[PDB]
From Swiss-Prot, chain A:
It comes from Mycolicibacterium smegmatis (strain ATCC 700084 / mc(2)155). Belongs to the EccB family. The gene is eccB3. Residues 1-18 are annotated as: Disordered. This is ESX-3 secretion system ATPase EccB3. The chain crosses the membrane at residues 63-81. An ATPase. Part of the ESX-3 specialized secretion system, which is required for siderophore-mediated iron acquisition and for the secretion of EsxH and EsxG. It is found in: Cell inner membrane. Part of the ESX-3 / type VII secretion system (T7SS), which is composed of cytosolic and membrane components. The ESX-3 membrane complex is composed of EccB3, EccC3, EccD3 and EccE3. It comes from the Bacteria.
Swiss-Prot record, chain B:
Disruption phenotype: Deletion of the gene impairs iron-bound mycobactin utilization and EsxG and EsxH export. Part of the ESX-3 / type VII secretion system (T7SS), which is composed of cytosolic and membrane components. The ESX-3 membrane complex is composed of EccB3, EccC3, EccD3 and EccE3. This is ESX-3 secretion system protein EccC3. Part of the ESX-3 specialized secretion system, which is required for siderophore-mediated iron acquisition and for the secretion of EsxH and EsxG. It comes from the Bacteria. It is found in: Cell inner membrane. The lineage of its organism: Bacteria, Bacillati, Actinomycetota, Actinomycetes, Mycobacteriales. The chain holds residues 2 to 44 of 1325 of the full protein.
Length: 81, 43
């Protein structure tokens, strides 16, 4: 196709790679933390951690769409006046 | 003086399945594209 390049980090064998000292959080780390905290909260409530269907995310996204419908109704009734 | 023993065969304990358990490796860190919000504000 186009012969892309996967993410790679070889071993260093050199005294620079031990010197990073920075903590910066990626998109993959925050998505992995979202997945772990949605597997634990579906592991102390649903008591099954297969994560096929997660109902807590369904409820929380339902109340978030409620708040979003509130905000869109506010921006719709503000432009009326 | 002493009694007599008869060497009846040993009972067998449930043996360990000494094999080679293999685990498939983890996936390969797929590069998610940042969602490019013009196709994210529509939902």
């Amino acid at each position: 196709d186009r012969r892309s390049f996967s993410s790679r980090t070889p071993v260093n064998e050199n005294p620079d790679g031990v010197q990073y000292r920075r903590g910066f959080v990626t998109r993959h780390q925050v998505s992995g933390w979202r997945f772990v905290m949605r597997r634990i909260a579906s592991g102390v409530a649903l008591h099954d951690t297969r994560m096929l269907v997660d109902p807590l995310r369904t409820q929380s996204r339902a109340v978030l769409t409620g708040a979003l419908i509130l905000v869109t109704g506010l921006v719709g009734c503000f432009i009326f006046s | 003086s002493r009694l007599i023993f008869e060497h009846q065969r040993r009972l067998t304990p449930p043996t360990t399945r000494k094999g080679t358990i293999t685990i498939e490796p983890p996936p390969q860190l797929p590069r998610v594209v940042p969602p490019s919000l013009l196709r994210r504000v529509l939902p």
